[PDB]
Nucleic acid binder design. Structure first.
Ligand SMILES: Nc1nc2c([nH]c(=O)n2[C@@H]2O[C@H](COP(=O)(O)OP(=O)(O)OP(=O)(O)O)[C@@H](O)[C@H]2O)c(=O)[nH]1
Ligand SMILES: [Ca+2]
Ligand SMILES: [Ca+2]
Ligand SMILES: [Ca+2]
Ligand code: NA
Length: 326
DNA sequence: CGGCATACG
DNA sequence: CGTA
DNA sequence: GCCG
């Protein structure tokens, strides 16, 4: 019926079980806030299964045979089908622990571990953090200062103007270098919390040393509100009607030999990529990352000229980015 | 039961 | 530890 | 939490 790995099935951005998937993803998120990566994965995968279905789930019977639905996830769906609400999910939603971990981890520079420590220390609100700035890293100070802007979704309409600014700086840094939009926008999203760009050059090796040159030029243009190599996680100044707003932008450089692997990895979704790497390793005996695909028996790397090549070498039907919304 | 993606900053 |  |  439906295969067990999310990389084996198309997953569109919009689907027929939105409410059920959102409920499961609350439990997934809450598991992650408690450090239970296994439970987070199962709830994420069960949610993703529903996203891949061709029609709404109406009755519990329709979960029989679907992968990743056991007693717990099935009970969640059952309660939503019978009452429109799942008591467990609602308890999580209104819990002080969930709400505060959510608010803290949403800060750029704050992960689960930091948020958990703050929570145990008694901290609960953004103003609690602002009042004791001595415990904050420079990254976290920037994420806290910019938090309101960064909490607002970026529009696909904003992205093109920003891509052109990046292209101009990239072209000065290295003529002929290219900029490719990746992340959720490449999967078709009309909004997102940040913009992702992948940079390369058609002559292998010319990209060496490129990212610092790009960042220096963007900084000289006054566009960088914050930046800390081949990956840069920045906060950019983006024009707005009569003003501007802070936006998170990630820049990545890859040599053209690795570009298909980097494009695949940075286009996501996060669950899709984890499932693809898991499939590669556990079903095909091959090790996948954003740089390449390694056969550990022959000790050789697969040359890829396209994403299509990578799917073929893993024995998977090709999925365009818009069907990778696992 | 073991496993749960895999890097870089 | 943070980030993707 | 679930799969194999
Ligand atoms: N956020 C995130 N992305 C990750 C991780 N690991 C990983 O490979 N990625 C890759 O990085 C890509 C871009 O990260 P992102 O957070 O901007 O993802 P996105 O564009 O779908 O999210 P957004 O729509 O909220 O902007 C993901 O789609 C995914 O392929 C991870 O742990 N977290
Ligand atoms: Ca089952
Ligand atoms: Ca993004
Ligand atoms: Ca990103
Ligand atoms: Na964070």
């Amino acid at each position: 019926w439906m295969p067990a790995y999310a990389c084996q099935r198309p997953t569109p951005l919009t689907h027929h079980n939105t409410g059920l998937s959102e409920a499961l993803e609350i439990l997934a998120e809450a598991a992650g806030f408690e450090g239970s990566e296994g439970r987070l994965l199962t709830f994420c995968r069960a949610a993703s299964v529903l996203k891949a279905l061709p029609s709404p789930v109406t009755t519990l019977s329709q979960l029989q045979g679907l992968p990743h639905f056991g007693e717990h996830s099935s009970r969640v769906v059952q309660e939503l089908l019978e009452h429109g609400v799942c008591e467990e999910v609602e308890r999580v939603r209104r819990s002080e622990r969930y709400q505060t971990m959510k608010l803290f981890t949403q800060i750029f520079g704050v992960g689960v571990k930091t948020a958990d420590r703050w929570y145990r220390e008694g901290l609960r609100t953004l103003d609690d953090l602002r009042e004791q700035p001595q415990k904050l890293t420079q990254q976290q100070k920037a994420g806290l200062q910019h938090h309101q802007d960064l909490s607002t979704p970026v529009l696909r309409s904003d992205v093109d103007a920003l891509q052109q600014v990046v292209e101009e700086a990239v072209g000065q840094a290295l003529p002929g270098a290219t900029v490719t939009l990746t992340g959720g926008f490449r999967r078709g999203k009309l909004q997102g919390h940040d913009v992702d760009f992948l940079i390369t050059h058609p002559k292998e090796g010319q990209e060496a040393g490129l990212l610092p040159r790009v960042m220096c030029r963007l900084q000289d243009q006054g566009l960088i509100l914050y930046h800390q190599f081949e990956r840069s996680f920045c906060i950019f100044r983006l024009p707005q009607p009569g003003s501007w707003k802070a936006v998170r932008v990630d820049l990545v450089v890859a040599p053209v030999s690795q570009f298909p692997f980097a494009l695949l990895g940075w286009t996501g979704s996060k669950l899709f990529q984890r499932e693809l790497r898991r499939f590669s390793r556990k079903e095909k005996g091959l090790w996948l990352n954003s740089h390449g695909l390694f056969d550990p028996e022959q000790k050789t790397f697969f040359q890829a000229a396209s994403e299509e090549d990578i799917f073929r070498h893993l024995g998977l039907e090709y999925l365009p980015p818009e069907q990778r919304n696992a």
